Ligand binder design. Sequence first.
Ligand SMILES: [Zn+2]
Ligand SMILES: [Zn+2]
Ligand SMILES: [Zn+2]
Length: 333
Amino acid sequence: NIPYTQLDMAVVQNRPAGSLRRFVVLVVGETTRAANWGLNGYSRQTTPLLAARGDEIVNFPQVRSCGTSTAHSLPCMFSTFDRTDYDEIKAEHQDNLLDIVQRAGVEVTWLENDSGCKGVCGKVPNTDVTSLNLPEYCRNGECLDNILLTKFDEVLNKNDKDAVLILHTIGSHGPTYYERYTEAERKFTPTCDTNEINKCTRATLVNTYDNTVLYVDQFIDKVIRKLENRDDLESVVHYVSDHGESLGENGMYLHAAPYAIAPSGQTHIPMVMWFSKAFRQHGGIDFQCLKQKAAENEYSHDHYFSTVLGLMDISNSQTYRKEMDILAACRRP
Ligand SMILES: [Zn+2]
Ligand SMILES: [Zn+2]
Ligand SMILES: [Zn+2]
């Protein structure tokens, strides 16, 4: 019974003349938390493939989520609203980040493997891959995230337009944490190989969760592998989780704790970025500047909206905020 507000009706892309195609992948993580992320100095190396890439990967050790649950964080991070002003009803009744990006002429595709896109993806091309139920990847109606990679090349090769591809993963979601990885990532043992996580010790729970992080690491790595040798493409891979998780600290499990009293495990989330050779050469970013800002500054889901607009060279936007675009402070005139 309330009015919908279309936003940013003037947007266009303003790519430099003669530009290469720009292809951006937004990996939307799930449940993975900052405190168990190798690149953040966690005592275990849960991110070996990203770590081995050294400064090719920009890591952000101080990032906070908008919510402690998926249905809160996803619409909030894709909305113009910052956490402190976010309102579910207001956000549902206006254009979101992807509606605006698509209007600007960018090819947006959403690939879903996490039980639903929470109303964010309906107006752009979207496919839920979980129903494929491939025996290689899937059991009990959930699938290992690598299933998303089976549909990646089709999006990459669809046409020559600049693109934003969202890969919405199941990541570290519990209580079936054991389903989130394979034998190749089962490095921390013993494990809790049941949904009844109360029947496991919290040490074995942490082990199992850390193995899920190894799978996140290899997933991001495989996405980078699809793009890093495409010298004719300016590609960016951005990863951020939706929220963290509690692993029995003070008797707290799972997530969705009320934001104000939520433990740091649920609000402090990992975020990384990777940039292709052509992007680094032509994209205008000062990478030493960026490395320093990533290390020193606190960021949040609030930065997501304008960072993504900035990655597509979207001009004539009223919703864009240069101060909330992570890269703008390091972007050359
Ligand atoms: Zn309504
Ligand atoms: Zn959940
Ligand atoms: Zn979630």
